[PDB]
Short mmCIF file of C-alpha atoms in Angstrom, two decimals:
data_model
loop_
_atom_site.label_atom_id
_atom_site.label_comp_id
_atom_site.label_asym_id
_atom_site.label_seq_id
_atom_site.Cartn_x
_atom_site.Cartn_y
_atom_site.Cartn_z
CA UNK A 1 73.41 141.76 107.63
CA UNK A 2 74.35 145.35 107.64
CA UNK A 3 71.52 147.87 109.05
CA UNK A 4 69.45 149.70 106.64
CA UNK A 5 68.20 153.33 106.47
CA UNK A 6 65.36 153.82 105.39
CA UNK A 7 63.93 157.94 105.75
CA UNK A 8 59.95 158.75 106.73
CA UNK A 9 60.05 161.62 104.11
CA UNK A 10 61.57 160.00 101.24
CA UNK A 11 61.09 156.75 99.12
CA UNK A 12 64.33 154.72 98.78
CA UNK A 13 63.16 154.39 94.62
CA UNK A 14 64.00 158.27 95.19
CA UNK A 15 67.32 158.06 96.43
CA UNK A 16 68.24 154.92 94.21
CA UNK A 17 68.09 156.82 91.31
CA UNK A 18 70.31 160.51 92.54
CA UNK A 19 72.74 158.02 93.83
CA UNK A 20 72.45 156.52 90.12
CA UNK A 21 73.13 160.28 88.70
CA UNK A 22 76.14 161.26 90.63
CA UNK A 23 77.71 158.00 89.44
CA UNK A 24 77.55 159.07 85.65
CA UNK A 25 81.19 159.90 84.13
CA UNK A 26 80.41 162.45 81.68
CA UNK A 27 80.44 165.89 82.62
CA UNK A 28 76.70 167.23 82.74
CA UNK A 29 77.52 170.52 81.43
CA UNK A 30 79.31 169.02 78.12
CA UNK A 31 76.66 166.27 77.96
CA UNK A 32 73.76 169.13 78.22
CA UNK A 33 75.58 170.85 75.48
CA UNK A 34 76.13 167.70 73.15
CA UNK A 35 72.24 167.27 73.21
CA UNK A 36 72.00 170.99 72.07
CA UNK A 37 74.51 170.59 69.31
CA UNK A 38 71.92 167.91 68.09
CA UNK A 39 68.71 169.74 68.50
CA UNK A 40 70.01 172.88 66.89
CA UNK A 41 70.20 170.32 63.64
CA UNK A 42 66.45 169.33 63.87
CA UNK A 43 64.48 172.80 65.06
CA UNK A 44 65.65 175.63 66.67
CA UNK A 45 62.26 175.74 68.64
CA UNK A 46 62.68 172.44 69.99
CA UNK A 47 62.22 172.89 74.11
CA UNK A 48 63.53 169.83 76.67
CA UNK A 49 62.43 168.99 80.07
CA UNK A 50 64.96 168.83 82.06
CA UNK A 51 64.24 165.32 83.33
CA UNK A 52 64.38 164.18 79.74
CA UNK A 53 68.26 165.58 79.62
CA UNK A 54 68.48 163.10 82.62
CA UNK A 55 67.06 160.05 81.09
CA UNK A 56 68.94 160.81 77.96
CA UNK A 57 72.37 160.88 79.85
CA UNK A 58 71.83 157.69 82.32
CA UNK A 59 70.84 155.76 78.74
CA UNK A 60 73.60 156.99 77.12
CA UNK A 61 76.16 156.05 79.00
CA UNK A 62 74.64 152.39 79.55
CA UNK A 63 75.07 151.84 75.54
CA UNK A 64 78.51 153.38 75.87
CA UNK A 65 79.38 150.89 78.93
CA UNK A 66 77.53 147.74 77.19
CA UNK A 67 79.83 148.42 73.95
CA UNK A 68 82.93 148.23 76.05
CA UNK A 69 81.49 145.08 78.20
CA UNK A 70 80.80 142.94 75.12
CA UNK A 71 84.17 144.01 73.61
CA UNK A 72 85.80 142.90 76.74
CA UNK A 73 84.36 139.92 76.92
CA UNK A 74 85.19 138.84 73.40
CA UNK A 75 88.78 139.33 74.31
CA UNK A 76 90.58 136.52 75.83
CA UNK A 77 94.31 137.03 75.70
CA UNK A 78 97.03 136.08 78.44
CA UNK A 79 99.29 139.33 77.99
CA UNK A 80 96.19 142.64 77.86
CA UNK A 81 96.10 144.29 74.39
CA UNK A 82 94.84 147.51 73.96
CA UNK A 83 91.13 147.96 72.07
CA UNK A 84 91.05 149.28 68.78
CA UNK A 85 88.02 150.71 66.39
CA UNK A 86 87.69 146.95 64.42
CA UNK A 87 87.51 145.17 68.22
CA UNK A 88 84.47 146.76 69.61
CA UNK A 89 83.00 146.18 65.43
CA UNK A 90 84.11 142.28 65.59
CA UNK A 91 82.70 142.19 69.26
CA UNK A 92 79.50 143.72 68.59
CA UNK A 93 79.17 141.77 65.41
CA UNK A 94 79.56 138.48 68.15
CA UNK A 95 77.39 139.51 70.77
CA UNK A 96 76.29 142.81 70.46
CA UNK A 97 73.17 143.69 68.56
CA UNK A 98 71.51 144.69 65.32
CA UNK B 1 70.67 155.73 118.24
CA UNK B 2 70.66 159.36 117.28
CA UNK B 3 68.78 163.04 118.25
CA UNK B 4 65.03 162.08 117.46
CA UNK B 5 64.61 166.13 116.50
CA UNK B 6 67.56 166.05 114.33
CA UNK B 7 66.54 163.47 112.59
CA UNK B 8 63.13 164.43 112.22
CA UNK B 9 64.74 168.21 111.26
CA UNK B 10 67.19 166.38 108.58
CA UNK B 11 64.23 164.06 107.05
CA UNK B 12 62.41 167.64 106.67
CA UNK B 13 65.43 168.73 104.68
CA UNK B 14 65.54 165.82 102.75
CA UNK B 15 62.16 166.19 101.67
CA UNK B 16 62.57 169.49 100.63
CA UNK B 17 65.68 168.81 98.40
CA UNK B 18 63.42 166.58 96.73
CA UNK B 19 60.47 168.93 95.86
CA UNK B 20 62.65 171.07 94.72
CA UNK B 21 64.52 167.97 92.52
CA UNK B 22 61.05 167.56 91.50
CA UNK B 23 60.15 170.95 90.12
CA UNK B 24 63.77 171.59 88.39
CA UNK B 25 63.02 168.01 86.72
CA UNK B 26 60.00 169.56 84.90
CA UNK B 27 61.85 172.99 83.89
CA UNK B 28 61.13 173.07 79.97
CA UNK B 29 64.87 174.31 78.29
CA UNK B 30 65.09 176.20 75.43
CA UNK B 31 68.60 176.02 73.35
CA UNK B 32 70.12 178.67 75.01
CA UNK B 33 68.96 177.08 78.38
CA UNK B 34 71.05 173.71 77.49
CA UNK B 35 74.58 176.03 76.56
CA UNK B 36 74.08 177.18 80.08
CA UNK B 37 76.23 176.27 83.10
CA UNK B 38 73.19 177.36 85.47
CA UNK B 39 70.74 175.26 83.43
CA UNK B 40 67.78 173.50 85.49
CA UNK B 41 69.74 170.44 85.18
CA UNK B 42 72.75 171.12 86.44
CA UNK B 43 70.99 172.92 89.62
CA UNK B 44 68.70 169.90 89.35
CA UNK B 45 72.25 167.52 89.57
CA UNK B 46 73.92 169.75 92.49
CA UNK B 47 70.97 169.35 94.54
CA UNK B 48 71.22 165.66 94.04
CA UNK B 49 74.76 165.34 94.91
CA UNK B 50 73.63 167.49 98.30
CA UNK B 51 70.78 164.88 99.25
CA UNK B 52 73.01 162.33 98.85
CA UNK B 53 75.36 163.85 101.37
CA UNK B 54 72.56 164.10 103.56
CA UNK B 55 71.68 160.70 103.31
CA UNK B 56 74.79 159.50 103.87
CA UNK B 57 74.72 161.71 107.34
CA UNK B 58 71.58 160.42 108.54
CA UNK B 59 72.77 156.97 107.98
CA UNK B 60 76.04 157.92 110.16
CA UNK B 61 73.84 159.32 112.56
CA UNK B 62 70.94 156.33 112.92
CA UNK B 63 74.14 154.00 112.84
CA UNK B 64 72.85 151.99 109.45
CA UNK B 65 75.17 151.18 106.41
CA UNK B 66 74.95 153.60 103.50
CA UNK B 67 73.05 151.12 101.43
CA UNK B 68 70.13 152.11 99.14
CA UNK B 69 68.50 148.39 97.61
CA UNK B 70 70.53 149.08 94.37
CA UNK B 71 70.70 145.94 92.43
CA UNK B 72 74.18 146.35 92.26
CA UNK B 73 74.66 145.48 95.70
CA UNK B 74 73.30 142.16 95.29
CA UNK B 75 75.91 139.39 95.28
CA UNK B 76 76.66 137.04 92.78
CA UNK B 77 77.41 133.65 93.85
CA UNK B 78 80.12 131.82 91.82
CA UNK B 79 80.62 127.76 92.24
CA UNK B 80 81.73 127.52 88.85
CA UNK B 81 84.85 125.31 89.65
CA UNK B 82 85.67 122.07 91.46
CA UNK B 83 87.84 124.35 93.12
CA UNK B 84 86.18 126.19 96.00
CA UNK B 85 89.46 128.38 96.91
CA UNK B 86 88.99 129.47 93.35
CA UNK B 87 85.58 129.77 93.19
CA UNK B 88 85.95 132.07 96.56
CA UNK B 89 88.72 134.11 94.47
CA UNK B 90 86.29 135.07 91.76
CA UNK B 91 83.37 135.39 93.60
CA UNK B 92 85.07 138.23 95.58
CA UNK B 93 86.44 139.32 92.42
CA UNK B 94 83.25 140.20 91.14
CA UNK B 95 81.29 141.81 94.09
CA UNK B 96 83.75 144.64 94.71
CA UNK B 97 81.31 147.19 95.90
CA UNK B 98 80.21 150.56 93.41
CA UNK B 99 79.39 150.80 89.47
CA UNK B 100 82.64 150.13 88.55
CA UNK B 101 83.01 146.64 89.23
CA UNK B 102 83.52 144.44 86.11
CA UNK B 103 87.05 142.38 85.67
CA UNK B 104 88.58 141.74 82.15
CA UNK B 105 90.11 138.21 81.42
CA UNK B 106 93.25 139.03 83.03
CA UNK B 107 91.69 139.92 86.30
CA UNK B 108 89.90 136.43 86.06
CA UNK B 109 93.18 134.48 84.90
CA UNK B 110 95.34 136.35 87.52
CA UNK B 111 92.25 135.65 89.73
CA UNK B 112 92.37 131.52 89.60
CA UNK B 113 96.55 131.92 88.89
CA UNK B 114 96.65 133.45 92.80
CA UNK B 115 94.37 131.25 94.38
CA UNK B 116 96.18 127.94 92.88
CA UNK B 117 99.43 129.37 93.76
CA UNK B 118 98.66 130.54 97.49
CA UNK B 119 96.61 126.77 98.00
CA UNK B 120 99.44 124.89 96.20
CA UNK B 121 96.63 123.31 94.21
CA UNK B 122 99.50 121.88 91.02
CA UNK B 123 97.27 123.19 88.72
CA UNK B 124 98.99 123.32 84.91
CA UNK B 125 99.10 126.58 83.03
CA UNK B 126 96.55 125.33 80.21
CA UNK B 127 94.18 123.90 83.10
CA UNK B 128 94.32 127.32 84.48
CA UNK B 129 93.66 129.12 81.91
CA UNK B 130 90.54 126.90 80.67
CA UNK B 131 89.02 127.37 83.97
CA UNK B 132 89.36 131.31 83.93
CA UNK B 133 88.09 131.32 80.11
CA UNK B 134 84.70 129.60 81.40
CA UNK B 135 84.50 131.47 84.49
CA UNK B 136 84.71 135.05 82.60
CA UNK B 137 82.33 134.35 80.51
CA UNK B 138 79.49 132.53 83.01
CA UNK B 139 80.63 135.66 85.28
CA UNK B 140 80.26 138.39 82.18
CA UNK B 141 76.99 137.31 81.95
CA UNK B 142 75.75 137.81 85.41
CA UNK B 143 77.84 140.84 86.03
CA UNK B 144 75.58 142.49 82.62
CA UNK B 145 72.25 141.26 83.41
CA UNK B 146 72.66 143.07 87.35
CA UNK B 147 73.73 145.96 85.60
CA UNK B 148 70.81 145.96 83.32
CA UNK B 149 68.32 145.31 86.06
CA UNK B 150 69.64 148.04 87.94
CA UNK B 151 69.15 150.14 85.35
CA UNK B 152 65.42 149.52 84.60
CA UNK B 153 64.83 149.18 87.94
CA UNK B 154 65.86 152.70 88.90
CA UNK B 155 65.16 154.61 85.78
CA UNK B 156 63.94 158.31 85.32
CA UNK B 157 61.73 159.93 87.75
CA UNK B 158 58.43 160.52 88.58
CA UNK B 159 56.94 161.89 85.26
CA UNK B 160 57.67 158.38 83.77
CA UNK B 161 56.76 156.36 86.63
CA UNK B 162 53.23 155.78 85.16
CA UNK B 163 54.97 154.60 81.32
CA UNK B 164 53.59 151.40 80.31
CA UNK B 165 54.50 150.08 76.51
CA UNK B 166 50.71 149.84 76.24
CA UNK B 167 49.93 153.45 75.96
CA UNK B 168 52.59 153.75 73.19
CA UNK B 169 50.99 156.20 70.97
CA UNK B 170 52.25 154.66 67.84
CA UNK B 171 50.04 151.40 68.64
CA UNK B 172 46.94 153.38 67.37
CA UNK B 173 48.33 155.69 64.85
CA UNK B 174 49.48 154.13 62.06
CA UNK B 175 51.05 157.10 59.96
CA UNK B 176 53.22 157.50 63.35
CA UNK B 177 54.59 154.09 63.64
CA UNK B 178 55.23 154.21 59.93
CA UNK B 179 57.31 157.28 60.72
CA UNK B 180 59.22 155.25 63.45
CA UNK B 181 59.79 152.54 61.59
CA UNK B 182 61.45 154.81 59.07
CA UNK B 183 63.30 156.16 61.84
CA UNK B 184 64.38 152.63 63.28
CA UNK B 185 66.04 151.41 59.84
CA UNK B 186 67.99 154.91 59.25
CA UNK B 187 69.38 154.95 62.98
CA UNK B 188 70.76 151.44 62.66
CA UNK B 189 72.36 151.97 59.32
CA UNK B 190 73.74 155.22 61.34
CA UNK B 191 75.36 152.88 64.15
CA UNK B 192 76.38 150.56 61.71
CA UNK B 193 78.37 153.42 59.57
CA UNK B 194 80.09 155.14 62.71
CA UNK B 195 81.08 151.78 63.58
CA UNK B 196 82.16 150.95 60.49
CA UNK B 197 83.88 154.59 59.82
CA UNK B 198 86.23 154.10 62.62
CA UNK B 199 87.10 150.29 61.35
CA UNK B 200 88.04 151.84 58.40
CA UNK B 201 90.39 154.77 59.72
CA UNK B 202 91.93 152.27 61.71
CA UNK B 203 92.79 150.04 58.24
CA UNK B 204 94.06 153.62 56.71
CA UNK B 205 96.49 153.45 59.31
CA UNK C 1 103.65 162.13 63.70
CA UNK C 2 101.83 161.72 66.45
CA UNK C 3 99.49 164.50 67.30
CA UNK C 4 96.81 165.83 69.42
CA UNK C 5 93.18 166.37 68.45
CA UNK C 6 91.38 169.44 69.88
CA UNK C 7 88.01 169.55 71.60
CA UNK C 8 85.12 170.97 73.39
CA UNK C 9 83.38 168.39 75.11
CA UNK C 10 83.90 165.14 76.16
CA UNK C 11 87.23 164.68 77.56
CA UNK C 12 89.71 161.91 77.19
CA UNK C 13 90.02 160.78 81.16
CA UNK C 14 85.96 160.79 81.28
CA UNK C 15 85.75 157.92 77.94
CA UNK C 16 88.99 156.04 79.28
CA UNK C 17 86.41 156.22 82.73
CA UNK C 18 83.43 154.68 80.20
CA UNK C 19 85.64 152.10 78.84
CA UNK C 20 87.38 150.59 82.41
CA UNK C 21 83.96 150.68 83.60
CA UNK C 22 83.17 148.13 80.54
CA UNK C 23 86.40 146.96 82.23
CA UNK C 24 88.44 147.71 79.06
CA UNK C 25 91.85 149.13 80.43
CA UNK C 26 93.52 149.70 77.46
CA UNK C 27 91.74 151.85 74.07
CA UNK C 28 93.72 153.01 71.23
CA UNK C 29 93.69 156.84 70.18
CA UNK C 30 90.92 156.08 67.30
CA UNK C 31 88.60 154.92 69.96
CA UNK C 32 88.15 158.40 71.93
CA UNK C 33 86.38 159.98 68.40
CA UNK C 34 84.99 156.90 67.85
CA UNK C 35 83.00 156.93 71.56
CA UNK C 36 82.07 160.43 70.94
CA UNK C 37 80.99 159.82 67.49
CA UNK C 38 78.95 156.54 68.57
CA UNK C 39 77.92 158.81 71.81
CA UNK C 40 76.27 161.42 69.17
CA UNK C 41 74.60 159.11 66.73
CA UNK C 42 72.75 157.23 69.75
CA UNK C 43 71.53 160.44 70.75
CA UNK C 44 70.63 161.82 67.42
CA UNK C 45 68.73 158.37 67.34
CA UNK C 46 66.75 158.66 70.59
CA UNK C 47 66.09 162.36 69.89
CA UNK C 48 65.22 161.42 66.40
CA UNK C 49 62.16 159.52 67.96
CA UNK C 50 61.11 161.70 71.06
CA UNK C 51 60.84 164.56 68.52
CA UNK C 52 58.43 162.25 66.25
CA UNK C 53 56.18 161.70 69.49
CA UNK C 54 56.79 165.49 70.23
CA UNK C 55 55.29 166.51 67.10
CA UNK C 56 52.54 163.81 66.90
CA UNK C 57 51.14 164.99 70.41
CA UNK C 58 51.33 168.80 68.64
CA UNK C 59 53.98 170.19 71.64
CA UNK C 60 56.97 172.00 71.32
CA UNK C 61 59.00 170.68 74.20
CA UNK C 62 60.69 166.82 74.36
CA UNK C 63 59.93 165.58 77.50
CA UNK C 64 60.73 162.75 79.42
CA UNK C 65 57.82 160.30 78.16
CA UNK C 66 58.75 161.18 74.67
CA UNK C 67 62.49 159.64 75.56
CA UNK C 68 61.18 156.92 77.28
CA UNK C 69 58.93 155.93 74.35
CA UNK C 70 62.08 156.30 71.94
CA UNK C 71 64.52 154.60 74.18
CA UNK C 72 62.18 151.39 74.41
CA UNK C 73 63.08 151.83 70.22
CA UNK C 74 67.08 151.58 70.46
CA UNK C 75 66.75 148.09 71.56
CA UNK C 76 68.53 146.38 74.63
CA UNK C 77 69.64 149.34 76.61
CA UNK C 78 66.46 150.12 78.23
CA UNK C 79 64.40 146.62 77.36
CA UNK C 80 61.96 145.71 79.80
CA UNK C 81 61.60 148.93 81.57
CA UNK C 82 58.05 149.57 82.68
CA UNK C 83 56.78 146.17 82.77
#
């Protein structure tokens, strides 16, 4: 059983959930500007906190993953094909939802 | 063990990176704000990536692993086969450390193919490939509901740390949850037509 | 015939990153404007909502509660969050 750290100044739920941010793939720059592409369609005054940018991203790419899980899982072939557009529909139509 | 003023000087630090975390997190952006590269978030996201250096440090330095409790780094146990060289085989399969960790079929197949072949177990091809069909998908499952529990488990920050579904505003305005349910059937039919968009490029082609 | 779309944005290594960490190794060109297309009409539909709680609660600025109360909307992605 491996030794834990655990810091007087700072709550582990803290550092759980940087840790969590620096894994995210997309860039946070592009991702930042993808959210202000869609705002700029609903109100031109619209403000965001920053922390809802955050919660936005982490989300975001969860749904993204969770489409390519369930279309993984839905494909069971010896030799690995490559995933089209009408695998990830069929897949979500299987398991995926609504 | 490690310099007890360090320590105490680096846990300062470490605090500190998190106030100011904190205060970045509740910078309100305007439009121009989000098209720039100096944006509150992305100074709130280098400041991250710095504490987590730190961390890692004062691990090195009180000699502890660089674990954090993630959910992730809980292990699943597989005893899915009457095969327990197999059953090893996947189970290590599967609890590869990081967020990255989720096998297709092939990695199960080739998985249980290795294992018989290095334990001369005689296992046929079609016996083989049963057993790795039922193991991906007991595994799948597992592998997706850690995932989701580490996700809900360490989610925002601390202006949502207080949320509970029963202070949803739209349970005692009615005009509002009228609007979201509005809302709810447009963005599914949105989903669905992407989805269905790119099925149909793909049959144009 | 074969040809290369342009872009600002979301780059082709970072969705081929999204999709291996679904553990799909292997996505066709269709499926890098598909993930940005599905990537945008998720967010349009959690913004959709935190802007209806923004404007119910009179504010101008989204903030986080406002995307938490949407993204318990979207269905499983964030279910069960917050008790």
């Amino acid at each position: 059983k491996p030794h834990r750290y655990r810091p007087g100044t700072v709550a582990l739920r803290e550092i759980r959930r940087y840790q969590k941010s620096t894994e995210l793939l997309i860039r946070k720059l592009p991702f930042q500007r993808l959210v202000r592409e869609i705002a700029q369609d609903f109100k031109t005054d619209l403000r965001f906190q920053s922390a809802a940018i955050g919660a936005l991203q982490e989300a975001a790419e969860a749904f993204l993953v969770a489409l390519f899980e369930d279309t993984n899982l839905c494909t069971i072939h010896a030799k690995r094909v490559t995933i089209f557009p009408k695998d990830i529909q069929l897949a979500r139509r299987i398991r995926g939802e609504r | 063990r490690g310099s007890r003023r360090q320590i105490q000087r680096l846990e300062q630090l470490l605090a500190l990176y998190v106030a100011e975390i904190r205060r970045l997190q509740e910078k309100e952006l305007d439009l121009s704000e989000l098209d720039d590269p100096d944006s509150a978030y992305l100074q709130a996201a280098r400041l991250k990536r710095k504490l987590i250096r730190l961390f890692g440090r004062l691990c090195e330095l009180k000699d502890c692993s660089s674990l954090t409790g993630r959910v992730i780094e809980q292990r699943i146990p597989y005893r899915g086969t009457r095969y327990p060289e197999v059953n090893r085989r996947i189970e290590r399969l599967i609890n590869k450390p990081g967020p990255d960790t989720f096998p297709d079929y092939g990695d199960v197949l080739r998985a249980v193919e290795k294992a018989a072949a290095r334990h001369s177990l005689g296992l046929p091809r079609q016996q083989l490939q049963l057993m790795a069909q039922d193991a991906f998908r007991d595994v799948g499952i597992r592998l997706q509901e850690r995932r989701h529990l580490d996700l809900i488990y360490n989610f925002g920050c601390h202006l949502t740390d207080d949320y509970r579904p029963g202070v949803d505003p739209a349970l005692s305005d009615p005009v509002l949850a009228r609007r979201l349910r509005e809302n709810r059937s447009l963005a599914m039919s949105r989903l669905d037509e992407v989805i269905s968009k790119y099925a149909m490029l793909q049959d144009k082609s | 015939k074969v040809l290369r779309d342009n872009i600002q944005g979301i780059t082709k290594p970072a969705i081929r990153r999204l999709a291996r960490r679904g553990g799909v190794k292997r996505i066709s060109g269709l499926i890098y404007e598909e993930t940005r297309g599905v990537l945008k009409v998720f967010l349009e539909n959690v913004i959709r909502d935190a802007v209806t709680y923004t404007e119910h609660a009179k504010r101008k600025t989204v903030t986080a509660m406002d995307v938490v109360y949407a993204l318990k909307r979207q269905g499983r992605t964030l279910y069960g969050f917050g008790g």
